[PDB]
Design a protein around this nucleic acid. Structure first.
Ligand SMILES: Nc1nc2c(ncn2[C@@H]2O[C@H](COP(=O)(O)OP(=O)(O)OP(=O)(O)O)[C@@H](O)[C@H]2O)c(=O)[nH]1
Ligand SMILES: [Mg+2]
Lengths: 65, 158, 42, 135, 103, 79, 305, 50, 245, 190
RNA sequence: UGGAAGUCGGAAUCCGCUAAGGACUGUGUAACAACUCACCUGCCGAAUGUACUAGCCCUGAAAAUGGAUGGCGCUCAAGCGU
């Protein structure tokens, strides 16, 4: 994870970096081989948390492609 | 002076078929080396093929003979390149034989077949060739069998 | 005597009959006629 | 076998857990601090105790440094608490003393100084064979 | 003992004289035992037994279906390079439960 | 189970007023919730109902089929 | 002194059933929402810890009881390599250890999360998550558990060969009377049958000579072909010839009723003669009632001499 | 694992570290020497108190 | 009716034949009739009937039907208003019990001579009278049970002794060998499988089959034959004696 | 469904004398006399034909109809018992320790008594008292065989089962230890 | 494949005699053998089989003092439906 972009409940939660359901996070996508139209490596991409980490013990996310 | 008949399954042109015989032909008084040499001499025509060998035992000597089988006849009629067994394995018999050659194989198999007609014998030979996996006239032996049962191919009578 | 064998070995057991408490309520010919009528209607 | 001598009649147990007794053999130890008694039952707040002929687990507090880091099986051969035998005789020794043995009963030492108890001598044949006086 | 010694014992001596008969009788009583377990087991053991029997029934009926049919897609046609493929730039979860400040 | 010789604590059938009121309120709330999900439910529902038909064991099913066919022909002739 | 003390290795489903039955039945199961969060956290933390303790105890019992090949005698190590792919054995036990450590790590993480869980629902979800991850880890071990149970049974039925003792080692072709000799000199139950490869695994018996105990090892028969074409049954005998400092008895059938030629027996003896260095070798001509050395052809007698 | 050992096993050729009889003899000698060295190392390196 | 027997579904390739096999038999019999002059009816009662394949092979020019008796009778035609050819309803009165049809071009005398001099020794079935007394001797059990001399017989297989105990022979395993009593033979008498002049049951016939002792014969009895040219049925010797329907 | 009438028939041989009163069946034969109380099943007995006993149930359910088959088989087994008798041949086999069986007849109780000794070398002496009417003998024709004979099938089979259950190996592998007494043959005396 | 004969494995699974019989459902052998199942025929004698639907009944999870259809007690009810 690179940063927390938006926690929908409160901007203070985003500022604190809280990982909840529906939170947009920024992830390092260097391992997926995502590349632009000329060859630059795209290493930062938004994803959204789809689980409840406080109840499941893990952070599960879906890429926003 | 009593008659003993022993059937065995052996590879042609190989002496070691008598390895399992010496457990039983031993107390009968036969020489295993002589039996293996006779087996190799009888099956020298069937090099590299699994064939059935009949041994008739009279008075502590045995004479060898080769009982023809449909599978061995089909594999021989395939005319495979001459091959060594131990080095390369898992082979497939995907060459072709003619329906004519199937007919003389059935004619050889008439003493074993219980079919009323030579057409009935040819259909059993085609089923054996289908199990082997070869081709007949460039087509599938099941397809030739179905065409024969439909009647557009006329098998000669006897 | 009993000519066959029983699996459990109770050789004294009689030749039992089917448990059909609704026996005798229909003749055979009537059932055949009803079968033909049911088939035609179907 | 868990080292519980069988066939022993009931006698007064004079050596509880924490007692320091003498070492009667020449194994190099001179005293044995008892930490457990083999065959002791379960009872709330009751310390395990042993008598003459009882097998115990002990540690050496004075003696050779090689014996100071291990927990040794011991057999109690003399006790100072008076106890009664089957012939009505009440008796006691002038000191509490035991010997170091293996779990099967054979001694680590080769000789015993002073007498041994009748119960210990009867229950462990190596004590009888290595004893000079039996009382 | 070494190697296949129980098998060698069975070869040289056999089994108990009633072993086949008792095995047959137990297999015959298996149906009554299964019904008795279904009607008399209680609690978590009963729940696990019921779930396991449900799984066996599903597997069995699938086996029956396969043995019965041993001898026997998008709406619009698209080419092979357009298969397995799928404005509003919405996120997969546009709305969640709000979280209070005690939570 | 050794129930007969040594029974356990009995299961009371005497319900409490708290439990009765709570069960009634949960039942009413469930009824309202299923009505709401029925109004919001997107599953397809056929306007026509699949009619069960006529039983095979009815002995005059053939005569009833005769009557239906005759009335169909009569209606077709009238129309 | 054998490997019969290895505890039985259940499969994945039986392992999960055992562990979860211990968690269900050896711990209390009623916790109320009206209690304090400290009591709820203690309840669910105790559940997670007891589950991982059961898993770790069983995995350690599996690991510490199976033999370690790096500490065995070379005969025992290579015999286990002949019977079993040693790569497969080490991979199975390494996967067992990896699953044990992953279970411990998951339990530690979920106990740390239960320290901060704030409700009974969150505690219950965390406990279920930890137990489900443990069950997934155990379910991903379906094949090594069956393999190791089969390994345990065969190791329990394996004979006990002492690598450093007074030992005789009977070798040769099939059907030359090896098991007959072993039955005649020992009390071992080696099957004697006329067919080839009757003995498919090593047998051992014992005898007393001059009040000294000797062990005699009956081996599967050995055929005459290069070592790359040798199956595991014959490689047990090859390993016994290679790693056991023994007295080798090479049995030959002069009458050739074994189904093999005396020339081939001589070539096999000459081929395995390099293994006989620092070993005492005797050639036993068996079945002399049928045919004798005097009745043998003089060229074959000259070759044997 | 099913094809290696068991009732469904089809494995018939072991994985060897040697090809020739002389190589096998050398392997056995080296393994025995290493084994003796390891037991000497372990030997150089009543229950004990807690 | 919750308590019912669980019907086992067989996971095998071959299914039940049904009505289609009956129609196929009807078509085959009704097509075989206009090709052969003579139609014989033969009877094989209380018999194994596994040499009928050899009979079919030897009679290459003939056609043999061995289906259901009532289906063959319906195929030939029970009433004169149903018969395929004249006189066939006369022939249908011979079809009861275990019978068979033989359509042939040959001479009736030739067929009678073949089925008279044909004779093969076969295993007895339950119901036949035992022609002799069979007793397995005490000691080690061999394959034939004393029919051949014991020095020329292999010992019987060790897998058969639970079946022998089920069939009542008090055998036991002694060192991998099946024996009555002791290995040398003592403390017991020989086991009498059957006595002469006694109706054999299936247990005794199964024991005789396991010991390869044949106490019966394979005799096919020709009852009569219908001829197409004369349109009449000639009755043979067994036709008078056999019950008629 | 309540079936109006259901009936069964029991043929009776000429030697057999059957007396039924208040569902108490007494069967007399050449070998002896048997008595049974079938008062727990609602059956009407009759004589529908000379030498045939008729069992009937009126207005009974399917269970009441089905119980007539059990009654029929019980009375038939009583007839078979008083006519031909029942015989259970049992074999006792041993591996190392020979099993010693002694059969006596306790006269004050009037019943047979089977004493079993040296089973797996155990020093206990097992004792089974037989049901009255069951006669136990040691077969002289075969080796290590007991023969239990009687008129009551239930008594003979229960005595044989008691003999089989009293010699049961415990805490051992049944694959390896094969010893015991087993019921070999079940049949009729005549 | 050391051995593998329907039954350790992989892939195919055809034809003939048929009344019918799988390149085989299991037991079994080192491999065979042998037994058995699918299927067919002979005896018998008239109604059955499968899957669902609706009732009642059992299970469908329980802790901790001794107790609760309100209590006795109730079984062609003193239970259930009309
Ligand atoms: N005449 C005679 N026959 C023998 C002699 N020794 C063995 N035989 C026979 O040869 C067969 C060989 O069987 P085994 O004794 O098991 O020999 P083997 O198979 O090589 O021994 P294993 O490999 O351990 O199984 C036996 O069945 C004997 O009948 C002998 O000294 N004289
Ligand atoms: Mg051998």
């Amino acid at each position: 994870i690179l940063s927390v972009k938006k926690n929908p409940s409160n901007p203070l939660y985003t500022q604190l970096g809280v990982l909840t359901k529906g939170t947009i996070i920024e992830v390092n996508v260097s391992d997926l081989g995502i590349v632009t139209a000329s060859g630059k490596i795209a290493w930062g991409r938004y994803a959204q948390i789809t689980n409840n980490p406080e109840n499941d013990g893990c952070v599960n996310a879906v890429l926003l492609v | 002076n009593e008659i003993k008949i022993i059937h065995l399954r052996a590879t042609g042109g190989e002496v070691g078929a008598s390895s399992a015989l010496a457990p039983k032909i031993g107390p009968l008084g036969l020489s295993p080396k002589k039996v293996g040499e006779d087996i190799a001499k009888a099956t020298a025509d069937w090099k590299g093929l699994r064939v059935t060998v009949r041994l008739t035992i009279q008075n502590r000597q045995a004479q060898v003979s080769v009982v023809p089988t449909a599978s061995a006849l089909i594999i021989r009629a395939l005319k495979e390149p001459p091959r060594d067994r131990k080095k390369e394995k898992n082979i497939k018999h995907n060459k072709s034989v003619s329906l004519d050659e199937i007919i003389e194989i059935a004619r050889t198999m008439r003493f074993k077949s219980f079919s009323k007609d030579l057409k009935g014998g040819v259909k059993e030979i085609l089923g054996t060739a289908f199990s082997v996996g070869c081709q007949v006239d460039g087509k599938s032996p099941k397809a030739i069998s179905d065409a024969i049962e439909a009647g557009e191919i006329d098998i000669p009578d006897e | 005597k009993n000519l066959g064998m029983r699996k459990n070995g109770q050789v004294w057991l009689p030749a039992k009959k089917a448990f059909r408490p609704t026996k005798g309520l229909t003749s055979w010919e009537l059932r055949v006629k009803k079968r033909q009528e049911q088939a035609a209607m179907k | 076998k868990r080292g519980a001598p069988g066939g022993k009649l009931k006698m007064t147990l004079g050596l509880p857990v924490g007692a320091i007794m003498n070492c009667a053999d020449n194994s190099g130890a001179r005293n044995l601090y008892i930490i457990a008694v083999k065959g002791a039952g379960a009872r709330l707040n009751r310390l395990p105790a042993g008598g003459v002929g009882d097998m115990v687990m002990a540690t050496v507090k004075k003696g050779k440094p090689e014996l100071r880091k291990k927990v040794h099986p011991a057999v109690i051969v003399r006790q100072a608490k008076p106890w009664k035998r089957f012939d009505g005789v009440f008796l006691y020794f002038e000191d509490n003393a035991g010997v170091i043995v293996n779990p099967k009963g054979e001694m680590k030492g080769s000789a015993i100084t002073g007498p041994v108890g009748k119960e210990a001598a009867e229950l462990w044949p190596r004590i009888a064979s290595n004893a000079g006086v039996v009382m | 003992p070494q190697n296949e010694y129980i098998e060698r014992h069975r070869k040289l001596h056999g089994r108990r004289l009633d072993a086949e008969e008792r095995a047959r009788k137990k297999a015959a009583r298996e149906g009554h035992k299964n019904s008795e377990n279904a009607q008399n087991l209680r609690g978590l053991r009963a729940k696990l037994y019921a779930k396991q029997r449900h799984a066996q029934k599903i597997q069995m009926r699938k086996a029956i279906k396969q043995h019965e049919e041993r001898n026997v897609e998008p709406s619009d046609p698209i080419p092979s390079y357009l298969l397995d493929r799928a404005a509003r730039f919405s996120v997969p979860i546009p709305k969640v439960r709000g979280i209070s400040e005690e939570e | 189970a050794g129930t007969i010789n040594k029974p356990k604590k009995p299961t009371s059938k005497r319900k409490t007023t708290r439990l009765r009121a709570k069960i009634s309120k949960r039942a009413a709330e469930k009824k309202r919730k299923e009505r709401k999900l029925a109004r919001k439910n997107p599953e397809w529902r056929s306007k026509l109902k699949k009619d069960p038909g006529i039983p095979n064991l009815f002995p005059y099913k053939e005569r009833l089929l005769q009557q239906i066919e005759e009335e169909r022909i009569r209606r077709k002739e009238e129309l | 002194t054998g490997w019969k003390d290895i505890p039985p290795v259940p499969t994945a489903q039986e392992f999960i059933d055992i562990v979860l039955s211990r968690t269900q039945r050896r711990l209390p199961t009623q916790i109320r929402p009206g209690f304090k969060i400290s009591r709820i956290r203690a309840f669910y933390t105790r559940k997670v810890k007891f589950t991982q303790e059961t898993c770790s105890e069983k995995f350690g019992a599996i690991i510490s009881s199976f033999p370690v090949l790096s500490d065995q005698h070379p005969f025992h190590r290579d015999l286990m390599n002949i019977l079993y792919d040693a790569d497969h054995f080490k991979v199975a036990l390494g996967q067992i250890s990896t699953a044990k450590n992953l279970i411990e790590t998951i339990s530690r993480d979920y106990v740390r999360l239960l320290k901060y869980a704030q409700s009974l629902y969150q505690c219950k979800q965390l406990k279920r998550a930890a137990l489900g991850r443990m069950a997934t880890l155990i379910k991903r071990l379906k094949d090594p558990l069956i393999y190791l149970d089969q390994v345990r049974q065969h190791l329990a039925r394996l004979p006990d060969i002492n690598p450093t003792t007074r030992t005789l080692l009977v070798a040769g072709f099939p059907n030359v009377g090896k098991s007959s000799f072993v039955r005649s000199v020992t009390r071992a139950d080696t099957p004697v049958e006329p067919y080839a490869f009757t003995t498919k695994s090593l047998f051992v018996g014992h005898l007393d000579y001059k009040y000294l105990r000797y062990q005699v090892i009956d081996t599967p028969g050995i055929l005459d072909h290069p070592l790359e074409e040798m199956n595991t049954i014959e490689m047990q005998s090859v390993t016994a010839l290679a790693h056991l400092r023994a007295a080798v008895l090479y049995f030959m059938d002069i009458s050739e009723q074994c189904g093999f030629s005396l020339k081939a027996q001589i070539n096999l003896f000459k081929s395995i003669k390099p293994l006989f260095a620092n070993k005492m070798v005797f050639i036993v001509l068996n079945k002399m009632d049928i045919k004798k050395f005097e009745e043998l052809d003089p060229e074959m007698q000259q070759e044997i001499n | 694992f099913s094809e290696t050992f068991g009732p469904k096993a089809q494995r018939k050729r072991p994985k060897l570290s040697f090809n020739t009889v002389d190589e096998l003899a050398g392997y056995s000698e080296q393994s025995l020497d290493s084994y003796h060295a390891r037991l000497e190392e372990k030997k150089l390196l009543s229950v004990a108190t807690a | 009716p919750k308590s019912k027997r669980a019907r086992v579904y067989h996971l095998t390739q071959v299914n039940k034949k049904g009505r289609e096999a009956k129609e196929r038999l009807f078509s085959n019999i009704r097509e075989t009739i206009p090709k052969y002059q003579h139609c014989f009816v033969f009877s094989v009662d209380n018999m194994r009937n596994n040499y009928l394949k050899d009979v079919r092979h030897e009679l290459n020019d003939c056609r043999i039907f061995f289906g259901k008796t009532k289906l063959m009778a319906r195929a030939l035609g029970t009433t004169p208003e149903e018969e395929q050819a004249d006189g066939l309803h006369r022939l249908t009165r011979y079809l009861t019990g275990t019978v068979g049809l033989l359509f042939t071009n040959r001479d009736p005398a030739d067929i009678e001579s073949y089925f008279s001099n044909l004779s093969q020794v076969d295993f007895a079935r339950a119901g036949t009278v035992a022609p002799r007394t069979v007793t397995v001797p005490p000691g080690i059990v061999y394959s034939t049970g004393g029919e051949v001399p014991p020095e020329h017989d292999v010992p019987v297989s060790h897998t058969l002794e639970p079946e022998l105990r089920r069939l009542g022979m008090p055998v036991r395993m002694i060192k991998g060998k099946v024996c009555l009593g002791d290995e040398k033979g003592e403390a017991s008498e020989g086991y009498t499988i059957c006595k002469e002049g006694e109706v054999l049951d299936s247990r005794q016939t199964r024991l005789l089959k396991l010991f390869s002792i044949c106490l019966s014969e394979f005799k096919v009895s020709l009852l009569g034959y219908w001829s197409s040219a004369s349109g009449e049925v000639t009755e043979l010797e067994a036709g008078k004696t056999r019950p008629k329907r | 469904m309540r079936y109006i009438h259901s009936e069964e028939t029991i043929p009776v041989p000429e030697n057999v004398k059957v007396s039924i009163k208040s569902r108490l069946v007494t069967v007399e034969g050449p070998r002896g006399k048997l008595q049974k109380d079938l008062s727990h099943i609602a059956v009407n007995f009759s004589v529908v034909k000379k030498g045939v006993i008729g069992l009937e149930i009126h207005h009974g359910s399917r269970k009441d109809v089905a119980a007539l088959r059990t009654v029929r088989t019980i009375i038939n087994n009583m007839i078979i018992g008083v006519t031909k008798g029942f015989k259970y041949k049992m074999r006792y086999v041993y591996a190392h320790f020979p099993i010693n069986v002694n059969v006596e007849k306790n006269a004050e109780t009037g019943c047979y008594e089977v004493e079993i000794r040296n089973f797996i070398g155990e020093k206990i002496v097992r004792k089974v008292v037989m049901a009255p009417g069951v006669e136990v003998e040691i077969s002289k024709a075969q080796k290590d065989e007991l023969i239990l004979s009687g008129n009551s099938l239930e008594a003979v089979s229960q005595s044989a089962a008691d003999i089989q259950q009293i010699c049961k190996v415990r805490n051992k592998d049944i694959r390896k230890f094969l010893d015991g007494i087993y019921v070999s043959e079940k049949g009729n005396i005549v």
